[PDB]
């Protein structure tokens, strides 16, 4: 199969006698296919930056193995030559420490896997606006990607209500470097939605949040590009194209429903 860098796919496997799914000694979790009881699903994501050229996954069964080849596609993201190259920044030492501390926190949060659906059917858009700057716009040096937009931006006047794109559990709700005021929601199955640059946070860590429920107010009045909501999705351990992920997720789960029981 084929996958564009920085996107996720939902891999389908036979359920009977399946034991584990691996990528070079990394284990990939599985979950039920909601519409075919004989199938299970797994989420595989390619990183946007410096991805492998090909990927071989092995599904181990009780008495056989199945190989799955994924070729990485470059896609057709918007890209611009970064003319300095130098791209090494020197934050003051106090900023460096805060960035490192928030990175260790985020890394641990994203690897704490929830093995059940916290979501409620389809994802909805977190506000009924439009994209102003989409995922994956890249800045290249000679021709390796130096940086890229790791989420998608919606137009929003400062103070616009922002709603949970799906049900789940709030894992982050605080001011972080780069992301500003941010909310991160665990939806289960290693899927997290991200809401950055907020002007107001209206939830607490560990709160159960319903789809369409208010999580804060849009902000970023003073950003490099002015007020907007930055929306992100992390799935399969990587930032992925969020609208492309939502489209793929909804095709599978949109006829399902769940209200929190725990
Ligand atoms: Zn953004």
Numbering used by the authors: 20 to 281
Give verbatim excerpts from the published study on this entry.
We have described herein the reactions and the structure of Pgp3, a Csd protein of C. jejuni. This enzyme turns over the cell-wall peptidoglycan by both the d,d-endopeptidase and d,d-carboxypeptidase activities, as documented by mass spectrometric characterization of the requisite reactions with synthetic cell-wall fragments. The Pgp3 LytM domain contains a highly conserved tetrahedral Zn2+-ion-binding motif (H168xxxD172 and HxH249).
The structures are: (i) tartrate-bound wild type (WT) (open form), (ii) citrate-bound WT (two structures, closed form), (iii) H216A mutant (open form), (iv) H216A mutant with tartrate (closed form), (v) H247A mutant (open form), (vi) H247A mutant with pentapeptide 1, Ac-l-Ala1-γ-d-Glu2-mDAP3-d-Ala4-d-Ala5 (open form), and (vii) H247A mutant with crosslinked muramyl tetra-tri peptide 2, NAM-l-Ala1-γ-d-Glu2-mDAP3-d-Ala4-mDAP3-γ-d-Glu2-Ala1-NAM (open form). The amino acids His216 and His247 are strictly conserved for Wat-1 and Wat-2 coordination in the M23 metallopeptidase family, and for the core of the catalytic machinery. We decided to mutate His216 and His247 individually to alanine in order to abrogate the binding of tartrate or citrate at the active site and impair catalysis too. In the case of the H216A variant, tartrate was sometimes observed in the closed form crystal structure; hence, only the H247A variant was pursued further. Since crystals of Pgp3 contained one or three subunits in the asymmetric unit of WT and variants (H216A and H247A, both discussed later) depending on the space group, we analyzed the oligomeric states of the WT and variant Pgp3 in solution using size-exclusion chromatography with multi-angle light scattering (SEC-MALS) experiments. These results indicate that the likely functional state of Pgp3, as measured herein in solution, is monomeric.
